[model samples]
Target: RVLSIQSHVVRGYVGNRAATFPLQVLGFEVDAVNSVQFSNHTGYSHWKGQVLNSDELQELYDGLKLNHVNQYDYVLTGYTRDKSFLAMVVDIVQELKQQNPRLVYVCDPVMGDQRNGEGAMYVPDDLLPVYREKVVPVADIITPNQFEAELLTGRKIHSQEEALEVMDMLHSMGPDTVVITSSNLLSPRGSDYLMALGSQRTRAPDGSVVTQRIRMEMHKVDAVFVGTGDLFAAMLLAWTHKHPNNLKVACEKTVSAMHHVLQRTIKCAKAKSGEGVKPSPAQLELRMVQSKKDIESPEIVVQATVL
Candidate 1:
């Protein structure tokens, strides 16, 4: 079972659906807790909605615990608007972990995208330290973009060496595995330059230092969509479930799946244009469906052990 804390909407799909539906399609039992429900994401001008406070979130979790829904296998979180909500989430994680020691927490610190630092959509400056001090140190897996990684680690990662340094700092913060998606430094070098970084730390009897990096070129043909990061996190969690101990193989498979999806989306877009028609819903749906189907059979681009 997977538990996701994120935004929800009645009319249009957004955070929770974007992350949970793909996992459900991949045959995972999912329970989603809404941090807030809105007409849609606030990116649009006309979106007027109410945000849920931390107390309300705590009440919901308390109710869940009272009803004995404490056996979740994984907890995934994204996009917190309130510092109190972050605290509530940490408390819930602690309780859940105490109940089930093996449960993994996957945190997609969706504070904001890399492009805008102080924009309205960006997480408030006051809350950033709360995340670094309270939230990040407890996550088992952290998925951050190049900008977010730098912000969390306070280190400028402009090269492979710097990226690894930031990854080590992040690992020291708490996460055993760290995936830095969309680094600009690696761009222009080659198509296969997207990177994933992890650490070699565990408590198993045979445990040893372990690190992995996967570099795959983004397909030029694919039209980048808004929720690709969410898709990547969902797919990575599913892949990790299958290959829990092998970070190298898990990162490779997830990246390959993303590439396959992007390639298929590009093909469908081209085919529609060739036929002199706009891309239909069927074409978009085909991409999502096919991407999930193709995850198990991804075409690996490049794989290397991280030093």
Candidate 2:
């Protein structure tokens, strides 16, 4: 069983909407708690939504606890905007870890992204402080996009060397695995593509420690859509558990699945738009329904390079 705490929308794929379906398709009993319930994701200025507070999350979890529903194998959380809610998440992680010692917590620290082209911060300022101070330590696996990694590690990652260096610093803090979700820096090569890298600390049969690092690169065949982060984290949770003790295969599996999802999405959008017409967000909410096959059986092969 896996618990996913994220945002949700009625019409678009982001947060739990993006997360739950993929995990279910990959074969897991999924429990979802929406941190926000919007008609559509926040990218649409005209969307209507309600932000859920810490109290609401507390009540929901309290009901679960009363029902003795406490044996979750994994817990995935993302895009928390409120300070109080983040504190509650920390408390939830601590309690859940106690309930099941083997619980793997994947924290997608959704602070902000450079995707908007400004490299400006989008989330509330206080959220970063909470994520840095309260959330990062308890996480077993954390997925921070390149910009978020820079903010958390307090170092500019202009090259793959700096990326590994910062990830090592993060590992020292607590998390055994650190995945940079997106990087614009040079990684020995790649003039046209961006990259995402994963680093994990592992032990050999003889108990000698080894750091496993894999780099996955991506391209935007069409305009980028939202919710890829949500998809990535959920896929990582499912695949890592499925491919236990094999971080490289887990990375391969996730990157493969999302590759098809993205490719299918882009192709569909290209078809929908007329000769010079631009594809709108409404048109590109991720043709996830059409890409269900990719979720169950990802056909795309992703090359994960060891670093």
Candidate 3:
């Protein structure tokens, strides 16, 4: 069983949680703990919500603990509201790890993205230091976007070399493996492409410096969709469940699965509106895995380098 703790918004199509659904399809029991309940992601100006406090969060976990739900194969966490909550997560992860020493802890570090700098909505600059100081060190696997990686690692990641430096710094923080998703090196000019780097170094086991970029050329739209990163982390968790020793293979498979889902989403969106449409959770599940034929015959190009 895997436990996921993060935010829960009612308006969106649940894209982030959709990441875990594929695992369920492949047969994995998952328990999700929501930190905040919002009508939609805070990115939307009109959205409103109350962030979950440490006491409230502890109450939920206490209930689960009383029910003997102490054993979990994995414990995944994403966004946190403040330093207090972040500290609580660290304590929870430590306690849970004591129960199951082999339990993998995956942290998405969903602070914010490039569009908004340190002052991005929901994620405040004050919390950035806490994430670096408290939460990241306990993560076994971490998935951060280029921007978040830069902030966490304090390295300028404009070029591939800088990205590597950032990845190394993050690995030093304690995560055995680091995945930088949506990197500039992987993105094409004037296109909505997703590039990722998986480092495999030990003293710095950042996956491999291998680069994989998936491009959906047709949809140039940037919608503030929630949960995509959550989905990515979930898929990685599911894939790692069976391929724990091979980080490269697990990263590759998870990337491929995400590509498959995005491809299907693009095709469906174009068919429905003659333009980009909000990717549905059902479609994401349907294309969690793709055939080579599908990759070759894609409406958009998917490229990657295995190192």
Candidate 4:
């Protein structure tokens, strides 16, 4: 079971829609709490929505507590610009962790990312400290982009070694598992591919700890995608649940499923675009409903290397 707290779009997939559908198809009981309700994602030229305030979020959590249904196996969180609202999530996670020590908190630290060697912040600067100091410290698993990883650790990732160090630093921060979901840093495989890294730490039967690190490179797709991060995080949570200690296999399945979804999505988009002309946002919406078979039992299209 999962308690997914994220934004909800009425029309297209993004935060909750992107995550919940696949997670549910994978057989997890998902209870979604929309942090914001929008007509569509903001990628379009225009959009309108209502952002949930801290009090509203708190009230929602309180009701679950009252009904004695606040128990959860995992808590998954995503994009939010409000500082107080983010803090409210942290409070809820802390209390939930108290209730169930086995509960895992999967966090997508959606702050900002680097594009063309330029780093930018989509959320406010104030929310960065909240993530760095409070949110990340409480998280058990975190999926952050290259820029988000750098921003949280206050260090840049120039090479594989530095990236591993950054992940290790993230481990010190709190999360036992960390995935740099996407990075501009070129993999040794080449520039035509994009790299993603995953690390997991688990204690052995003795007092010793076993750490597994993996490297995955996926061919780059030209089209822009809005909900890929949310989907990636959701899939990772599901696969990790299936393969608890093996980050390599978990990441392989996760990335492979992503490749399947994106390939189908782009093929459909290209067909709708009718050659040369760019695909519209509507045409490029993720084929989530169509990819049910892939999500349920994704064939390994991408393989991860154990590093």
Candidate 5:
């Protein structure tokens, strides 16, 4: 269902590892193209690997085509730095869309996380213009956090209203669905937690377009864990296909799985850290292995509303 193009780490979860496991668990056929092969994800201070140049990436795709492997339900991508490489992917997506109009392209728009400060662009400022002009216009689904979304849409997203407005704006850019993965929306209830938001546009019976939005809230863990966004995009791809007409259920399942995996991860990390010594990324790596059962069958109940 997806062709994930991103970085690969042999040691810990970050790009493809963070995404592929959940997609497989949810019963989707996935092929991943690692744009960069590293010893471990960049969250670690020290890492080494070779980056995939344009020729290698093209060769991989060409080989896939030569093998008569053309039919695909979706294409998902993450942090892409090289401009020519991104344009290559964009060209491929355009061709694929032409061949299969129903094909969905999910771009995670990995501009790096807020590791040190708000709205930091880790993927390079150069990639932003490429993404805004080239990739987004061909994508059917885009998964970006509040930070990425606000930046991409050039609109501030401090609340639910701002989020929907941004989603609508992104939809105009070409995606039928736009998901805000991590956001600190201080709802009226209280600032006790933040949420993930998604919006889907579908055609009603009379051919009239109808828009449905869902908000999935998760309690702020008060600590950063790598790969959650990757996990969410992978989960959304599977469930959105699973429940195509019911996006509310899609958000529910995505949030439910993440909540379980994260809850388990936090508990394990805290236990390992023991007392006051700051949990390292190794100790804080997501408990995907430990929560295998949760990944296969997420049973957490989450709430959603129609907007």
Candidate 6:
């Protein structure tokens, strides 16, 4: 069972709406707690929402605990804007981990992104310190995009080498598994492909530590997709649960599933939109329900190189 604490929307995908469906299709019992409730994702022209405070979040969790049903194999969280609420999440994860030491906590640090050669933070600047000082330490797996990675580690990644170093720095902070979900840096394949990187650290039977690093490149999608980051994090969690030790195989399946979903989504969007008209968010919504088979077992369209 996985407890997903993220944003929820009445329409369209992002946060928990983006994460929960695909994870369920991949075959896991999911319990979702919405950190934010919105009319729609913010990408749309207008959105209305309410954010959950620490007290409200605790009230929900307390009910589950009192009912003796808080046991979870995994805890997945993303896109939180409040400092106290984020800290409460950390507290809940810590208590859960204490109850079951094997529980894996997957955190998608949705800080912000770098675009068009500039960087910006969609989340409050204060949240960074909480994530850096508290959240990252407790996470077993983290999916941070290149800009978030740079922010967390205080380093720039202009090349693959620097990216690897930043990933190593993240490992030092806490999470045994670090996946840079997307990067602005060019891939060896060329300028047209988007690159993702993954690294995992595990202890061997001989008492030595083994590190697995992988690099992945996928054809760049022409349009912006709002929920891709959340979907990516969820897929990574599912695939890594299946392939615990092999980052390469895990990333391959995860990225391929995303590719399949995105490809199908674009095809449908193009068909729905008139010539020369860009697909709106409504048209661009991920074809998740239609791509069930792909999520269940993706054909490997994107392969990862073991580094």
Over all chains combined, what TM-score does candidate 4 have? 0.97
Model 4 error, position 116 (Å): 4.1
Write one digit per residue (lDDT tens) for candidate 6, span 99-160. 88779999999899987475899888999999999999999999998999999998988888
Q: List the residue pairs that clash in candidate 1.
A: 191-217, 200-210
Off by over 4 Å in 2: 115-118, 187-189, 204-208
Question: Model 6 off-target regions past 4 Å?
Answer: none
lDDT digits (tens) for residues 1-307 of candidate 5: 6778887888878889898888887778888899898898777778799999889989998988888786678888887779889989887877777667778888888785542146667776888888888889888888897888877887877667877998999988988888888776665456676777878888678978889887777766767788888888888888888788787888787888888888888888889996888888888888888778888887856777776
Q: Answer with 5 or 6, whichever has the higher TM-score.
A: 6
Q: Candidate 6, which ten residues in sequence have the lowest lDDT sum? A: 115-124
Taken over the whole model, the C-alpha lDDT of each candidate is 0.72, 0.83, 0.67, 0.91, 0.81, 0.90
Rank list by TM-score = 4, 6, 2, 5, 1, 3
- Candidate 4 Cα outliers beyond 4 Å, as residue runs: 205-207
Query: 1-307, model 3: which lDDT tens digit per residue?
Result: 7787877776553433454556566677878787887777654547787778999988988998998877888888887767788888889888899898768898888776775233243566788877899888889999888788887877757676677777778777788778886655544444455557776444425654442222222223233345567777877787766776556666566666555555565556445653445544333223333332432232223334543
User: Would you estimate the TM-scores of all the predictions?
Assistant: 0.83, 0.95, 0.78, 0.97, 0.94, 0.97
Q: List per-candidate RMSD values in Å.
A: 3.8, 1.8, 5.7, 1.1, 1.9, 1.1
* Model 2, residue 291: C-alpha shift (Å): 1.3
C-alpha displacement of 111 in model 2, angstroms? Answer: 0.9
- Pairs in steric clash, model 3: 16-227, 19-231, 198-207, 198-208, 199-206, 199-207, 199-208, 200-206, 200-207, 200-208
Q: Model 1 off-target regions past 4 Å?
A: 10-13, 115-121, 187-200, 203-217, 220-224, 266-292, 295-307
Determine the backbone clash count of candidate 5.
Answer: 0
